[PDB]
Symmetry: C3
Subunit: 275 residues, 3 copies
């Protein structure tokens, strides 16, 4: 049997149960959200994860296959480090770490025949190989003084159950395959340099990629889906999203008031610099 | 005939028409969005509603059924109250109130068989019982002076038409059932203490829940859906959302601007503290 | 024959293949996002496009049909204009323009039968006529100085391929038809007045509607869709979205910090009015 088979286990007039058994190259990537509190610059608000899309195009056995992957994390632990109540001590209100109790979700999609009209799926199963995700080096750019660097962190992702999901984005909506990963803490630990914290396992949520373009893991998946017998039917993929108009309005009002305040401030500095 | 039946009104080679007639306990909940303008703290920008999720797990007749509800409002009336044009007068540029002209929407979903692959439905109907919803007690936190409190408001929710809908979220996407509700004013009227306004009907948007963990209304729904005869197919439920990336970018630019302005202000405040 | 046909090209127990061929009135609309940087008010951070919803109701040949149209743009170029490094020169960090290399997407939907349970489509085609899109006059509200006005700009929208799409919103979710448009620059150019920029082509992202209520283009489409033979099945349309809760949380922290800073500024300014 080919590595990229496609078989029919039942076929009525309009519908047909098509089996698919195919190899895949999941190339995903974390993405971090860094919110820094105001004042001088010595207090950071959040260092968390954001679901991250990554579209690529790889080579199958004489075919070019475009893909779309989306990495997310669930059940992460919220740590924090506060060394003083004054505006000049380095503090991080809340930063996220990954351990055993957390999980790493990866939605995957391709331009192949398996994902063209997939809305129903049974007999789902996959053979995935394990990889090692290592964190990088994030230099907290303080206004003045020293520059602590959050450096280190290694954690091994192991295959787990598989499910379905939907990758929503501002361009495409994809009925996609959801691969789960569990975590086993590894030897390289992450530590904030020039600080009283070190030798704690996990992965940091500042620079997980470690300056990499992606994390690669190869796999195979096997399912049975409902596809119309005619191989010309198409399910809507693209999107045109206008969600959270109330949020857009809130942001517009905030920008208006912020421009008014900055105007008032620079006017106070202009009158105080017009002698 | 049972209360939670499951019938097969037809069956083809792959698909099947199934009828589902089931009892439900809609435990829903509102959620308010408050926005406080800058300046001193006597001026409020908006007090509105937001679509509010609530997931839970209730006992059926010997089954534990996990449920998921999402409330929302439409056609609400935007009242205002301005005591003057000064920084020190209490003013609320806009706050939302629920009345007869408006409608309340409640999306409902469960982990039962009626919802697993529900994409098509007909003969939809439900017999819901009416309830009462009373407003809360929201104490406007003013910087200095007395503390006005929005207190009162009671409206009875009457059952109306039933339809389908979709509960999108950052975790799950659900093909759900949409109960509609109309409103009738009641005797308890809402009013702001220490203010020249009172004896006006409706339900405030500051605290509708009245501190209740949820509002509860029982119901029953009967319908007929198209499901695959093989009860192993699964429709995609989970999500990994990255919608409004342009909005994320705008928020990042606004954070950068506000951090730079706060750093400027803090430096200008600290230069005067070196004597 | 008919202009609004509905044919049955095949039929089985529960499903069927229907062919719909209908005339339509695509009344779409552009929308701009004008972000103004802080400071004094001479510096503009960005002027971009945003996907624009517009819903209406128009008269077919004795039928009154409700419709919904969502415009978007893709591949738009980013131009910039800096007059100096000072706070007092009129600078536009970025404004978006449309040209040949770019494309305009229009997702279209009606309440007619062709869209009631459309999830699968084949033999999709369309005949569209060309229209003209022209820019208005966006006067930049400079606090002091002259008044630059971005004016002009005209482009011819020529039809292109048709596909499927999904219009998502905070209210409705529509499995819609995606008409694509390619562009050819016209003679009327866009120019900012009292400024050293003119005789450059494209469409300004400032006021693309030209003060109009919509841009109307007639059309006709033909397709072949899979529908339940029982013409009573309904697919979920309405929504209740709670997406980007983390973004809402970041915006709320931003608002709290901004209110605290504004309170500090206002107390600092009020303490100097006690004589």
């Amino acid at each position: 049997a080919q590595a990229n088979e496609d078989i029919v286990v039942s076929k009525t007039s309009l519908w047909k149960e098509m089996q698919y058994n195919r190899d895949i190259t999941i190339r995903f990537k974390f993405a971090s959200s860094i919110v820094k509190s105001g004042g001088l610059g010595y207090k950071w608000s959040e260092i968390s994860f954001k679901p991250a899309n990554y579209q690529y195009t790889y080579t199958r056995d004489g075919e070019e296959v475009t893909a779309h992957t989306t990495c997310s994390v669930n059940g992460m632990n919220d740590f924090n480090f506060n060394g003083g109540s004054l505006p000049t001590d380095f503090v991080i209100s809340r930063y996220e770490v990954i351990k055993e109790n957390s999980y790493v979700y990866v939605d995957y999609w391709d331009d192949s025949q398996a994902f063209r009209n997939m809305v129903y799926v049974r007999s789902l199963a996959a053979n995935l190989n394990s990889v090692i995700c290592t964190g990088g080096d994030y230099s907290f750019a303080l206004p003045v003084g020293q520059w602590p660097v959050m450096t280190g962190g290694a954690v091994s992702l192991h295959s787990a159950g598989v499910t379905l999901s939907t990758q929503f984005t501002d361009f495409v909506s994809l009925n996609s395959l959801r691969f789960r990963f569990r975590l086993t803490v590894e030897e390289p630990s992450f530590s904030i340099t020039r600080t009283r914290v070190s030798r704690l396992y996990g992965l940091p949520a500042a620079n997980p990629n470690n300056g990499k373009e992606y994390y690669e893991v190869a796999g195979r998946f096997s399912l049975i889906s409902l596809v119309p017998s005619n191989d010309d039917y198409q399910t809507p993929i693209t999107n045109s999203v206008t969600v959270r108009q109330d949020l857009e309005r809130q942001l517009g009002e905030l920008r208006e008031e912020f421009n008014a305040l900055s105007q008032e401030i620079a006017m106070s500095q202009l009158i105080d610099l017009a002698l």
